[PDB]
Amino acid sequence: MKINFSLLDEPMEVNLGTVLVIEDVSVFAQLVKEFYQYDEQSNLTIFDSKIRSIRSSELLLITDILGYDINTSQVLKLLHTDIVSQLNDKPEVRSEIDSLVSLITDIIMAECIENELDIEYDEITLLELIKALGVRIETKSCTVFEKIFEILQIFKYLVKKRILVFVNSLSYFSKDEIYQILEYTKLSQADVLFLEPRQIEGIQQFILDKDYILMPYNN
Amino acid sequence: QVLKLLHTDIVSQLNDKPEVRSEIDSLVSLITDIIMAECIENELDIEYDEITLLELIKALGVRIETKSCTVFE
Amino acid sequence: MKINFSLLDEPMEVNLGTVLVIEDVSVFAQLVKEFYQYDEQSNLTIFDSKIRSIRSSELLLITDILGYDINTSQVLKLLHTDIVSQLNDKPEVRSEIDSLVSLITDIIMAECIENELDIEYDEITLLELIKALGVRIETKSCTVFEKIFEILQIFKYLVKKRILVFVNSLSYFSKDEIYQILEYTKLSQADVLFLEPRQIEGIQQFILDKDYILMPYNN
Amino acid sequence: MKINFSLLDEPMEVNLGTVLVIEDVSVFAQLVKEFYQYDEQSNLTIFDSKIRSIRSSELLLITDILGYDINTSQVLKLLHTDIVSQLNDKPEVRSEIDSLVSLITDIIMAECIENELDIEYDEITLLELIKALGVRIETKSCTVFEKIFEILQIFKYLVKKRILVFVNSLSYFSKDEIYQILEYTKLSQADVLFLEPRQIEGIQQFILDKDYILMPYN
Amino acid sequence: GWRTVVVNIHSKLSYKNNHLIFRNSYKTEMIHLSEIDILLLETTDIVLTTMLVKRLVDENILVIFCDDKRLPTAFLTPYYARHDSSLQIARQIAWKENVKCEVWTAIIAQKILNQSYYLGECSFFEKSQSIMELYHGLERFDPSNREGHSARIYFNTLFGNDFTRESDNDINAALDYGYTLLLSMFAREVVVCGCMTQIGLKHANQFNQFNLASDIMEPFRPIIDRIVYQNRHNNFVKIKKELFSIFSETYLYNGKEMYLSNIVSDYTKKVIKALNQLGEEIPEFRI
Amino acid sequence: GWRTVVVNIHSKLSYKNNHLIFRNSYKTEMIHLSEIDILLLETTDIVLTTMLVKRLVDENILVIFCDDKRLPTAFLTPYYARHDSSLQIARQIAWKENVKCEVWTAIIAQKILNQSYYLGECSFFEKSQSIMELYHGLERFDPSNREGHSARIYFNTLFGNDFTRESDNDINAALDYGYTLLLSMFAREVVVCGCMTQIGLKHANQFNQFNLASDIMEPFRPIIDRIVYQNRHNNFVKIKKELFSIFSETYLYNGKEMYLSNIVSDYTKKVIKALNQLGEEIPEFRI
Amino acid sequence: EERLVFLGDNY
Ligand SMILES: [Ca+2]
Ligand SMILES: [Ca+2]
Ligand SMILES: [Ca+2]
Ligand SMILES: [Ca+2]
């Protein structure tokens, strides 16, 4: 997953988490602009190993961390599917659940037979039980760090988003929290690109000088 | 409207019996404890509200029989 | 790009080149069988970061190195497109080519005017010039190493193949040649998985013991 | 049958099953290159008992066992021609076939006359009956051990192929399976030659040292 | 657990989702941990994980490791089975020699009585009567060694006068095998109770980790000698299989017919409670 | 053997040609069997072979398994040719009350002295002097309860008069966390020594199963409360991160600057040998 | 419902 713009000599590769620091405010603001208008402008080009250019629909751009809505129909649906899979992996738990559901179904069926009208039904399933429970992610009480962590957790659930990009998001987190974010990103395998005006001390990052020179920096 | 009055009718019938509805509340409590435990097992934070008898009926899909062989039926 | 089978405790990640050595001939032959019948069998499961399982059409399996046909309609077409792009990147060269093509077109047009029949034409383009030249890859005189290198070079051209897998292909190449293959794979970013019965000395690899224990091994 | 290349002092004979180990990776890869390039390169030679060079068409080179398709246009052509020959060896059976085909052609012809649209037909032949049936060798192979057995069967069936060569194919089979393959090769009398980078313990094999000297083993 | 799983085959064992995971090239099988009673590894080619070992310690499942000869080599002993063990150590240090010699004397009386019952079921009136006489002659401190005499007459009459316990024959091999299995189960039960296994109830001088579990396994020895006596003509492998059938077979406790593991557990519980309560009731097991 | 092999890392163990094969992701090490004395496994990711176990039975080496908490859970018990540690436990059963009270009083004296010295390093001379006075006033049988009286002064000095051990706060959870880590290390050392940890140095309370190790770890306790005092403002996660660095940090033993593991090892060995030999020397540790 | 489970040779 390589990104390229006119200032760079060669396209730079983004693997796992990548911290890109632009020391020039003009190039930084211009690049963020190109990230929002990316479909309209041809200057910034992001391509995969196939050299195929990704669509802005495949690109996921996030600036406001707490203003972004983590709960979507697709995310909650695939999350419910994941929970159903977790309950299906355990044979004992699923049998217990099936017994309870069978009891409830017997009760409601008895009540339907007591009625004068002829009533038919089908089944009460686990996905319907979860949808009735209303399982969803809670961002209301979450701190910014827990919020970006939940975003990194649901980026796996997002199917269409190819790459996740944050703009000036590392200013909120402490050095240790940044270490946790990167070390978790290495495990999640997702491709995340941070954009910061100022360099962060202690983490590997790509620095773009006012001279428009790009250098790898260990600290 | 017909399904609303039917579901309300069955909810009334189950509310007329205190013991049966108590058993329903116990089983729903158990299922909610299981699903809650599986949600705690997950790495992602999860918020839930509750499960209600009306949501159980609508989840079951209680409706009048749709099978009609002839106009006479 | 993680692969998993019943013998493994956890799904293993395949990034860039990965050398997997199976010390048991039964598990090795069974796994190769599962690689060929992969669509039919559910035991071996390969999934991406999205956890989506890849289709056998997305899987590329290669055992015979010199028997594989590198020249295909899609590979030659996209290769011709790449050459056209290379000639388009240079403004001077393309202008020269356009001048020569214009001269030839003037000659043939004069000959068409000399004819008694009314004759119409359109243009002679660069892609048509390349197709008339018959540009293609030469595997006839290539050594096995040059052949697998050309395969690694055209895997970028293959759009549908998600992951490239070789079976017992590292027995032909010397240690240094293996180093060249891996170091080139890191640059090409492609996902390649080698399967060997015997461990190769000097390269990082994952070893599966007769005890069915998977361990990382530096040498 | 014997094979000869510049590294050997004298050409070694290949009879029934033969296991050849090359302890040099450069000579091994170069040897495989000489096998696929055998038509182009004159370095590697093969001399039969008649001491006559053979074309690459008579040489059957198979590296990937599972990736080798048993059903081919030529194989199905020779198989269909073989069955046609077997049915032509019996005059009565082929006559009954001609009678039944005559009956079916009369029925379908009658239904064509029943239709309002004009219909022209030619005839039905035994070869078209076989190709319509889809006669082919069995494609069911559970393991590479069975697939290589099918390869040995079709190789023994093919008369034009004088030798069968496998490249690094013995790494898949267990020692006992190697014994069964060698015994089946001795029972089938076919000429099979294996090429392995490393030696296999417990079986008779010809070891080619890095010094280029060839020595027998077991 | 109610299940005894015996693995004689090369394979890998792992722990996932409270399920024992049996992984092999030919097949894979998952068996829940709550059902498994005893885990027996009969070969040296088996591989396991220390996480599975930890879950077996928490599940309180006896793990036995055998040799290449398949005879048991070493079994896992948990340090803390239950919090009541640290409280029980003070009681075991506070035990009295009168209670130890009394309970051990009653247990030996139960063993000799069970041998007389076995010879009575085998219709030996002179030998069952003599063993019964030694049972009526058993006294504290065992000055007459009527237990050893009862054993010598027992094996000499069952297997013949030329037979001896010091012989290397497969009969004594199977006897030591069954005594090692029953000693392993009884030792595991003593680990469940928490008291020290090395402290015996009969002799202060003899120091052995298996002394106590041996004293508790004394009355159940004639159960092994029956199947050894029946299958003594069969090969040692079939004798071993018939010795493994003991776990499947059921025996009649005074209360009701229960499984061997339950009879050993309840018997050891009543023995420990009788030792801490100074001989309130002595559990009696009869064939 | 002599060397004590302990495995803290993910790895596999095998046996070939009388040589233990230890394999970890970084490197492979081969150790002769006669060189190894005691084998301990710290984590749950370690893979071993029943063939290696069979070899360790003939070698007599003690095998120690630990849980995810690193607290030792079970150990391997051979049916024959038992290890010498099982013979060493009897002396622990024979430990005299005078030796237990001497070692206990010395331990309390060392902990109180370290508390007073750390208050002197924090420059509270009135509280440090009071705790020192209680140190010089400590006596056998503890009629004065000067340890419980020194506690309140130490905690009140550190975290203030409002703070106490009974209240629920990140500071007390942090103290229990550090005492849990130290309890794991010292408990592991006691398990290495083979002595039963259920037998405590403090006669009055047998409730805890770790009583021996919990009594041995006390002179090293104030090292935790220092870090908890410095980081007391940080969240419990940060305090866990800071307490996790104590394993990497080096501290001053009386003889030489050494790692905490080696210091605790030498201290525990001196304690056990002093208890079996009835007070030859008492190991003394000062901050 | 089997008391003795054999994984291996069935003897
Ligand atoms: Ca609800
Ligand atoms: Ca439904
Ligand atoms: Ca044209
Ligand atoms: Ca041409």
Numbering used by the authors:
A (entry chain B), C (entry chain F): 1 to 219
B (entry chain C): 74 to 146
D (entry chain E): 1 to 218
E (entry chain S), F (entry chain R): 3 to 289
G (entry chain T): 100 to 110
From the paper:
However, the type II-A CRISPR-Cas systems of Streptococcus thermophilus and Streptococcus pyogenes encode four Cas proteins: Cas9; Cas1; Cas2; and Csn2, all of which are essential for adaptation in vivo (Heler et al., 2015, Wei et al., 2015). The structures we present here shed light on the initial stages of spacer capture and reveal an unprecedented higher order assembly of Cas1-Cas2-Csn2 proteins that appears to play a role in this process.
The majority of the particles were of a complex with a stoichiometry of Cas18-Cas24-Csn28, and a 3.2-Å resolution density map was obtained from a homogeneous set of 306,470 of these particles after applying D2 symmetry. The Cas1-Cas2 proteins assemble as essentially two dimers of Cas14-Cas22, as seen in previous structures (Nuñez et al., 2014), albeit with a different conformation (see below), that bridge the Csn2 tetramers. A pair of these Cas14-Cas22 complexes bridges the two Csn2 tetramers in the Cas1-Cas2-Csn2 complex via interactions between the Cas1 dimers and the head domains of each Csn2 tetramer. There appears to be only a limited number of protein contacts with the bound DNA, involving the conserved basic residues R55, K77, K131, and K160 of the Csn2 subunits. All the contacts appear to be electrostatic with the phosphate backbone of the DNA rather than sequence-specific DNA interactions. The Cas2 dimers are 12 Å away from the DNA at the closest point, so Cas2 may play a gatekeeping role in this state of the complex, controlling or simply blocking access to the otherwise protected DNA duplex.
